[PDB]
Amino acid sequence: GRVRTKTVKKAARVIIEKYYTRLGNDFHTNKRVCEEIAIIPSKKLRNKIAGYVTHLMKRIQRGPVR
Amino acid sequence: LMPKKNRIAIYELLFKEGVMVAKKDVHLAKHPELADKNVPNLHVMKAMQSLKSCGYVKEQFAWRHFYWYLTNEGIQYLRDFLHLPPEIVPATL
Amino acid sequence: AVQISKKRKFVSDGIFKAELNEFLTRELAEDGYSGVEVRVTPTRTEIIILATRTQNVLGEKGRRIRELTAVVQKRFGFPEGGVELYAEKVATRGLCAIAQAESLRYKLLGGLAVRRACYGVLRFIMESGAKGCEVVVSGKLRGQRAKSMKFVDGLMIHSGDPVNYYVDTAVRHVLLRQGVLGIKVKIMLPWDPSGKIGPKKPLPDHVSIVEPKEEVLSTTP
RNA sequence: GAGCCUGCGGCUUAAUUUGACUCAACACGGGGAACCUCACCCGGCCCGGACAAUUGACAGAUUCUCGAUUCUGUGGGUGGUGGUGCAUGGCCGUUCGUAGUUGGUGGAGCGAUUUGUCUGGUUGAUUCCGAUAACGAACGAGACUCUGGCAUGCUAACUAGUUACGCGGCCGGUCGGCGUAACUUCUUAGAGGGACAAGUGGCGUUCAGCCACGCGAGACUGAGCAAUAACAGGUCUGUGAUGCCCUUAGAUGUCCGGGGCUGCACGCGCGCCACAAUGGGCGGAUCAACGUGUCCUGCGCCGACAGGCGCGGGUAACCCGUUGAACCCCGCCCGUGAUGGGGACCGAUUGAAACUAUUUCCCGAGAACGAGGAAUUCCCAGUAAGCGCAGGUCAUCAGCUUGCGUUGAUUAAGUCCCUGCCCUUUGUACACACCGCCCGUCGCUAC
């Protein structure tokens, strides 16, 4: 059950197109960016977003994502 | 089967304050607000029942209790029965 | 005294809050009763009443307001002058579930129409600002057989924790000469970031992000 | 299957105490039956009585007295455990928590409607990816909420504790009890962290992910809230929820000691060992946890046990209480045996009252049941089970149930095989919709 929902899929993509240099390949640094940038009333949801951004960053540096 | 002396104590107390509260229990010994007399609960719920059927008091209920309010018409009915002048006014009004 | 324990003190308080609530919903339901808030303070128990129209509850010189003050002081055991009742007028009643539940109930008891009264309140809920409402009437509607017609417009959240502070549900009974009808009113509260209109806490799925504020790249120092 | 405990048929006939009978009936109605209150049953005091005459009554299963706005002063005021849940609402169960619904714009069709809402992969999931005459969103799902696993980091504790050296016995060591110095490991609860498929390897439209390794308190789980709706599936006996009807003063509210705890065989679930041998016994010894407490119970007299008496704490992290729980651990006894296996059936306490044993204890008492027919229930991790505790019910009580801790596995990290289930295609004379619709003979009546 490691599949993200549209709340995590959409948020992780709109945070990259607005902030690409901010997020790197570390989940812990990306986790702190979402605290100051986005407003989320949940902590477990922030880790899912920042966790999926880390997965996207490995794909971005590998090539153009679809 | 209701005496007369208790009828003045239940109506004058209802006159000085237009609120009368009684608990719905046909087996209660003495009314809490009527402590100086031995008025049973039947003489409080049935003697007030005749006022509602004749349209002299308005009742409310919260699962066990009556909340009686002397209507403007009912106070006029008690002004002559209790033998009080038309100048005095209750506390609620 | 009796030395009331805390496990029995909170219960004795919650029952007084519940019994006073039911007594007023059976007595002040015509003036638009919406609830009461208590503040247990020694020698001064301020029991405020929330209604939509408070000018008629007062009277000529505060006649009906003196009765209720004299009503609970004799049923719950409050001393003379030890209890004080205040009446306040609420705003945007379209967000109050029990206010709109008793509103169309007093119009459905006449058999006029079940579709005009329901549509009549749907406009006021949307006009006052809301993210969706619900009106459900069940029973022997338009025939001896029980029929239920649900009136839905907008959005509605059913599951989760936000359903406690974002949607208020009200249930009322309808007394008709042919049978009994039910009334389900579910008003959704608008997200007010301040806290004056409605709830302050946003939805958990409100990830909405702020703009980068046109971050400019420097060329030369 | 064996005895028994309760539940419902069947019987019984004052009445066996009624509803609900597949999943979704049968420790259900929070219903474990002395009175209550009980709707059932039969006897009776009775206006503790009214919208437009005595209540009594030592005499008895009738003599007379007193009160002095309530007496058929002359067609309706009202009560509800009486019916109808195939008339209802509110709630709840079930479909089914299987994941499924809806809008705008655009496209197709004269139109009802359709597309979106999908071949495939993946995911518990309409969860994503991908595909695409659809695009973009909403409900559900998820997120969220309370729980638990760690944080020697922080905030604080005489209503929680340890730790440091001093008066208590032994051999200063070694163990206990009694007092206000430092701060918080242990305890409590506040804030904030931590875990996201993040790292490596492998397999993959190299997407969605999946698998194995590390590091690590976990690669992580148990609740709750739960959609479009539907059922004639329950609730009128949960209500000052209610319509109508029946019954409404020889009463379809009570109540008195109470009757209603009822058997020739079949049925469910559940406790209790058997077929001592891994068990019963006896004596050690030694460890819980939630929750409740105006009733919980602590000490001293004395019963063998069950009890009883005075003195006390606790409305509670303060007293019970360091909750000395059982199983278990250790020593002895028992032994090809219906045995020390099995516990069936034959003085105190609660209250006004136990007869048809309320429970409890003592002695006596010793049946069936040799791991159980065809079938059938439940479950894969602190789980099943074993063991015991507490709450709800409660004057008296737990073979029930909701919780709780305790000891702790077998097997499986799977499949449509079977039985239940949604989606797609397909067919229909069905559409209050297979509990559907419909044909002919026969039978009745009329033309």
- As a whole number of angstroms, the distance between CA C131 and CA C118 comes to 17
Angle of helix B72-81 versus helix B5-16 axis, rounded to 10? 130
- As a whole number of angstroms, the distance between CA C24 and CA C34 comes to 9
Tokens of B15: 């006159």
- As a whole number of angstroms, the distance between CA B19 and CA B68 comes to 5
CB contact under 8 A, C27 and B93: no
Residue of A nearest to C214 (CA): A18
Residue of C nearest to A6 (CA): C205
Q: Residues A19, A33: contact at Cβ < 8 Å?
A: yes
List chains touching C (3+ CB pairs under 8 A).
Answer: A, B
- As a whole number of angstroms, the distance between CA B4 and CA B1 comes to 10
What determination technique applies here? cryo-EM
Tokens of C105: 């109930």
CA distances from C163 to C108, C129, C188, C199, C201 (A): 28, 18, 9, 11, 12
CA distances from C60 to B28, B40, B92 (A): 38, 36, 12
Q: Is residue C2 classed exposed, middle or buried when 0-12, 13-18 and 19+ CB atoms within 10 A define those classes?
A: exposed
Preceding residues of all breaks in chain A (C to N beyond 2.5 angstroms)?
A: none
- As a whole number of angstroms, the distance between CA C134 and CA C187 comes to 7
Cβ < 7 Å from strand D, A residues 2-61: 2-7, 9, 25, 27-28, 31, 41-45, 47-48, 50-52, 54-56, 58-59
Q: Is residue A58 classed exposed, middle or buried when 0-12, 13-18 and 19+ CB atoms within 10 A define those classes?
A: exposed
Cβ < 7 Å from strand D, C residues 131-170: 136, 138-140, 144-146, 148, 150, 152, 155-163
Task: Look at the block and give the residue holding tokens 């006009």.
Answer: C127
Sheet with B65-70, strands from edge to edge, namely B19-23, B65-70, B57-58
* Most A CBs within 10 Å, among C161, C166, C208, C209, to test the A interface: C209
Q: Is residue B54 classed exposed, middle or buried when 0-12, 13-18 and 19+ CB atoms within 10 A define those classes?
A: exposed
